[PDB]
Amino acid sequence: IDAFRLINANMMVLGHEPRQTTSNLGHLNKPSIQALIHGLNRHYYSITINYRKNELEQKMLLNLHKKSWMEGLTLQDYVVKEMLELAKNYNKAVEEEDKMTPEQLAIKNVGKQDPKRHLEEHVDVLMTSNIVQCLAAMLDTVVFK
Amino acid sequence: TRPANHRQLTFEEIAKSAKITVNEVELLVMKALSVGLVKGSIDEVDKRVHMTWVQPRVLDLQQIKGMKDRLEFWCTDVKSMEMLVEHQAHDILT
Amino acid sequence: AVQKVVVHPLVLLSVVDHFNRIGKVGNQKRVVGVLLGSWQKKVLDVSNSFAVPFDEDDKDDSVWFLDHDYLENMYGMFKKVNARERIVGWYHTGPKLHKNDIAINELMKRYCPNSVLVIIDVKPKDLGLPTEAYISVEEVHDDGTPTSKTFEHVTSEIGAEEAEEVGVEHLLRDIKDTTVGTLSQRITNQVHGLKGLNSKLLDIRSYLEKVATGKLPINHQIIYQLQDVFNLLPDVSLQEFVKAFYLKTNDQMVVVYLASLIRSVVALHNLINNKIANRDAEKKEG
Amino acid sequence: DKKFHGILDQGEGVLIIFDEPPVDKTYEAALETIQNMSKVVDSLYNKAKKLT
Amino acid sequence: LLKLFTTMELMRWSTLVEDYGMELRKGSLESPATDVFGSTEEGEKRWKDLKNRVVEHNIRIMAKYYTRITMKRMAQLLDLSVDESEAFLSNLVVNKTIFAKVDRLAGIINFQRPKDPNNLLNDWSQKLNSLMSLVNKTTHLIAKEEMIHNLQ
Amino acid sequence: QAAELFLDTVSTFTSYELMDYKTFVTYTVYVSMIALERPDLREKVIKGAEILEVLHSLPAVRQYLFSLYECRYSVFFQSLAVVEQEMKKDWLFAPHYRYYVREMRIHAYSQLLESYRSLTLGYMAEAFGVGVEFIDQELSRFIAAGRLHCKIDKVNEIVETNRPDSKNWQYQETIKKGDLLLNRVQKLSRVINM
Known part of the structure; x- marks a missing residue:
């Protein structure tokens, strides 16, 4: 979003420094990077734009935001295990190349720069994915009784 | 009338109360296969007329009242055991 | 045959500032307005709408005010900005209905193949869903009476169309994308367990109050x-x-x-x- | 010779044919973890080396 | 004819000899009877092709109730012998149009499906057909509930 | 390593180190009757003919191998007993041939057990003779030697084949390593402390 106040050559009698409250045009001054606009420091000084405390709508955008975007009525997910089948074949099929890194840790004395750390991205996928598999295992004894 | 299990029913009440013989219970369901309200998977190594999903009744207003032992049962038991899970899964609120 | 629409909260925020109009113009409590949009499919999008200066007598509730100065020439403006975004229906707040609503639908079914009434929510505290659609229906009965026209519960949703979050997800300033398995699941546990089983308590309100005082739809047909x-x-x-x-x-x-x-x-x-x-x-x- | 995946009998003399070999859940993960044990053993000398 | 085509209703074959046999007992057109069943070495191929209809079509309708039937009950219900049965087992297993796997170790076999050849699919079908219906529940229970709470 | 190290049989016709090549033929057969798998058996003694002719002069040996491919068991007793008579009378075996024979026999027995499940001993005593109480101490010790995964009954006479890998031990060996290993280098992980 962008906005500008056209100063003119009539007001060059006074200096072009309102300044009266500062750090608002100090933080509007914080970017000051647009190519021909930086150039157009002559004739132009921008205005400050905050966003309004919109909780009279940010409240209801929040309540429709999360009342909407997670399974709606939320009796929808409570797909489960062929995703895991495919995900378990993922989560074995990367495991041999995930375990090439301890071979890549077998430098004996020292011969290596930054460890090339592929430790993660396969911990946590199993972690939250099989949290989903075990509460997914709960959903029979949660839905039924 | 019995909601519970033993839904793999023997033909005994069928051959008794529904005035049919043993050789015709299959027709009694195969014609019902052409009906399609119940679609039972009837045993034929034990001649057991199995009960699957049905079109149950038309009105039992005494069980429109007396459905509480299933409806409120479902309500406070899935809700209460819901709070037993969430009461166990309590201080991971984080 | 309508499952869902796409809801832009932009003109819902016009329901917010017309909700700011009704608090300062006077006696009009409920925000009633007219819904623009285009039928593409069973799925639909609403990109604009407009909120009507409307009055409604409490005695003989079927007294509508949909001015055609307010309708026709504003449809010439709304047509003039875009030929695409024409009417699709209309809206009002409150959860249930309005003794006039059906007639208000038929004023604009001359304008649309299916003028939808989407009853809207200005103060969300709900246990179920947001704003939801109601399509033209003629279900009548197995009776053979004159044709019923009261517009039945035809499912909808709040759909999200396009980018638009240069504003929106900058205006989040609080929320995190959870990698599900990180408590979001128990949020869904509270909302479907709690918000499902209090709806079950609405169903014992149904299957107890209808046993108590409920007439003819006690056991109509469902x-x-x-x-x-x-x-x-x-x-x-x-x-x-x-x-x-x-x-x-x-x-x-x-x-x-x-x-x-x-x-x-x-x-x-x-x-x-x-x-x-x-x-x-x-x-x-x- | 694996043209015939069944089991014969003499006491009743009843031949029965059935098969389900493949479980890469057991095979792939288990043997990969055996390889993981080998690579941990490959790391135990980085361990005993950083000790002494 | 058309009654035999939808679940066939395991009729007596001699009543099929009544209906399809007394077309030669017609005091009218017998040219249907002669063109179709007045043939002899093609007509008996249509009589036994209609026995192929009783074993073919009636095995097609009895397919619902298997994984549990013996062999002699199958002969009893196919309205024919046990050796006629085993011949029909042979030609309908070289037909192999539905995955037959039979036996005479004690007889309890069938023309059959692949005999539930899967793991966890029972959970999906059972708990995800049933539980995805159960997540359909409240989504239409608000519809019925709000529509009946209009006036009471 | 005996049979694998005897794989060539090409550059070793008769050197000044080889007083008999036929003794070398005995030396490769006496271990290829244990270590050699059955497709490897037909891969060697049937797909390879370069050793066949110098044991074509030893037709009882060749008979014992093709019988070993067939599982006829009386000639196993005969020619295996003859092989045992040689095994007595040949050096570099005397500290070792106690392991030989019965392992030979279980090398026959397992595929015997791979024959089918509910076996009777009389069908076996056809191939065994009086292997009734012979297989009492024989099979009961072979079960008792940690081997010969089965079950046995006297009068209903159940014989068992099983040992489905994807069962427990494939699930076991990794923590078999990673418990003494875990406490081991974990114990190494505390020498840094005190």
């Missing part, structure tokens, strides 16, 4: 018909799902075998390089 769907599995003592327990051995089979072998792999994940980088950081400090 109560026993969906007492069938209630008779999926309502049984008495413990419902005896004997197939489902060694079937559940086939279930928990998978989850415990994956957790067993795979979390032993996670034991390599955590344990091994935890020790290596551990004791490098420990005794290589000296």
